[PDB]
């Protein structure tokens, strides 16, 4: 059974928030994993990208721990990535899944040419950096598919992107940096100011301010 420990969790459990986009609008940090399960639910699928052993040198000898990389997404506009290091593999995988579904961002999708039907590609060229790894995403015509390396392709598919061109520079053999760079590039889609977002913003009541009386009760 789920007993929330934060105001946002209590609001979500009491059916006061309709969609996760309400939380995304106010940039409220998410601290409970059960909210994403409540909203996204069954549409979420995850995949383990890498299991990496790391070692710390001690007096008696090396101490080994295992780090799991897990990418998650619903193939319909949301994507997340998680990394977790533990003594056992299963514990690290569970922690990585929790951490990946905690850090889930929405993805903005655009058109390449004529704007007919549903969006299929990235709005524009977006770049992500991690370590020495640089990843560039470029819009592609409909039906092209994803032209990238196997690692970024999984994240792009889980985000819901159908067509995209990809460029990469740096030591991409570092799988963690390679995944984090493209995750950052995907995350930067909603942070780009395009001319169709030039309208003045009409503000709305925050969930904390709107449901304050209900929060006082509970």
């Amino acid at each position: 059974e789920w007993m929330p420990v934060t105001k946002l969790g209590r609001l979500v459990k009491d059916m006061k928030i309709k969609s996760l986009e309400e939380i995304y609008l106010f940039s409220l940090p998410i601290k409970e994993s059960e909210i994403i399960d409540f909203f996204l639910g069954a549409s979420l699928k995850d995949e383990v990208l890498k299991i990496m052993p790391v070692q710390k040198q001690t007096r008696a000898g090396q101490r080994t721990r295992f780090k799991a990389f897990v990418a998650i997404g619903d193939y319909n506009g949301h994507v997340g990535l998680g990394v977790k290091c533990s003594k056992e593999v299963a514990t690290a995988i569970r922690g990585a899944i929790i951490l990946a579904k905690l850090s889930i961002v929405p993805v903005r999708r655009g058109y390449w040419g004529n704007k007919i039907g549903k969006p299929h590609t990235v709005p524009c060229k977006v770049t992500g950096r991690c370590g020495s790894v640089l990843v560039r995403l470029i819009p592609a015509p409909r039906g092209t598919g994803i032209v990238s390396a196997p690692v970024p392709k999984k994240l792009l598919m889980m985000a819901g992107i159908d067509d995209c061109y990809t460029s990469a520079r740096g030591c991409t053999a570092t799988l963690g940096n390679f995944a984090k760079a493209t995750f950052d590039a995907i995350s930067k889609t909603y942070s780009y100011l395009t001319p169709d977002l030039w309208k003045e913003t009409v503000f709305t009541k925050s969930p904390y301010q709107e449901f304050t009386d209900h929060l006082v009760k509970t």
């Binding site: 986009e21 995304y24 609008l25 506009g77 929405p106 903005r108 549903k118 969006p119 909603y190 100011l193 977002l197 913003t201 503000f203």
Partner: peptide, 9 residues
């Protein structure tokens, strides 16, 4: 209109 949400500026 085809967007998840409209972010505020």
């Amino acid at each position: 209109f085809v967007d998840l949400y409209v972010p505020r500026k």
